[PDB]
């Protein structure tokens, strides 16, 4: 279960951190309905690993942590996350009227902010938005990798983990964030694949330098908040 | 891999969507029994795509997304999936089990509901359910075709792909579903080779008009719920 896993301390590793936007509160609201979402997005997101032979290295509450041996392998992951995300039946609308609740709780309660996805009209929306949001953060760079005789697990720290993510921590749901080095890790032929906006140099928690993000518009047409910086 | 994909923009397409009713609740009553049930599932109908000549446009969870050249392959290919997997032999009555015990719970819970299959007796139960149920939905439709660089792939987009998505949405598990523009792309002949109830003009979510809907008898003597419509 560890061939996939990055294992050389030369080799530059993509990491990708995800997490479900606003699950706190979803867990709150519908407790009923949590449990098994969490489930098909933990199932999904497996499956997304398995297909592009990326490797999960933990698992934080919602929270994935993916390291992939190619960058390519990790942008199509995350694209085919929030494609496949968006066109599950989740068998709900709850969680979409909460997360357009959400936006107008903290519309009203915030100058300067409008919700990005509570303004689509219905049928509109439902082409955008569907079910859990996930926010994504990419990385690219040399880690400090770490072995596990336990688990046989690998495990990856250092600035480049860090880095993936703080990019994660800034994503919006159902926004998906590259970082320049894993945008440029990615051969100009793959980028040309790619439908990339990019997003100017962001201010990262604890970077003393602003880096240059790239958001892949997965789901075209989709819009966004701010970054989610610190204050 | 590509050569079963309709890929004129000219030329009518037959889209077959599918997925397996009540697989979240399924999940969670036995994550024990699923992952090997889902397994089949997908291998049965791996073998059905490959045996009718159809094209695998892709897979979102348990939901399989089929385009066809043929019409009339397209509906050879629900058939034989409602009989393949009733006459699988699952290795489980605790799948059949938790499907009665699903449509009792909805039975209390709703009035003007009956369970479709919880009132038969067990031997007739036996004779027309066995394991996973499956939802299929199928229309006929020019569709605006996407070819994938990176894949090699094909996909179907319009309005035509969402008719057959919401078709689907609608349908009972077991029970397979075409609007008249599928049954109507039949030849006459092909029509009359088959089992078909008329079930009348049907609201669909975001389509303006009502859509006629045809039900496929592909396990004759099967009884459904009314169609899943929105409220
Ligand atoms: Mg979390
Ligand atoms: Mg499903």
Redesign the interface.
């Known amino acids: 279960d560890n061939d996939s896993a990055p294992k050389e301390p030369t080799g530059p590793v993509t990491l990708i951190f995800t997490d479900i936007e606003s699950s706190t509160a979803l867990w709150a609201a519908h407790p009923d309905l949590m ?2 979402a969490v ?2 997005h933990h ?2 997101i497996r499956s997304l690993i398995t297909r592009y032979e990326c490797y999960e290295v933990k698992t934080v509450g919602d929270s994935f942590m993916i390291a992939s041996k190619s960058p390519f392998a990790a942008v ?1 992951l995350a694209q085919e996350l929030q494609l ?1 995300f968006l ?3 989740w ?1 709900t609308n709850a969680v979409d009227e909460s997360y357009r609740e959400f936006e107008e709780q903290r519309a009203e309660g915030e100058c300067e902010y409008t919700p990005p996805t509570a303004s689509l009209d219905p ?1 509109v929306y ?1 082409r955008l938005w569907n079910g859990l949001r996930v926010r994504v953060g990419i990385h690219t760079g040399l880690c400090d990798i770490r072995y596990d005789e336990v688990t046989k697990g690998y495990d990856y720290y250092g600035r480049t983990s860090n880095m993936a993510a703080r990019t994660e921590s800034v994503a919006n749901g159902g926004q998906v964030l590259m970082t320049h080095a894993a945008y440029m890790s990615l051969s100009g032929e793959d980028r040309n ?1 790619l439908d990339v906006t990019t997003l100017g140099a962001t201010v990262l928690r604890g970077v003393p330098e602003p880096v240059r993000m790239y958001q892949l518009n997965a789901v075209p047409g989709r819009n966004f908040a701010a970054l989610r910086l610190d204050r």
Chains 1, 2 share one sequence.
């Open positions: 449990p098994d489930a098909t199932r999904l199509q496949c066109r599950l039946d068998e049928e439902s694949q």
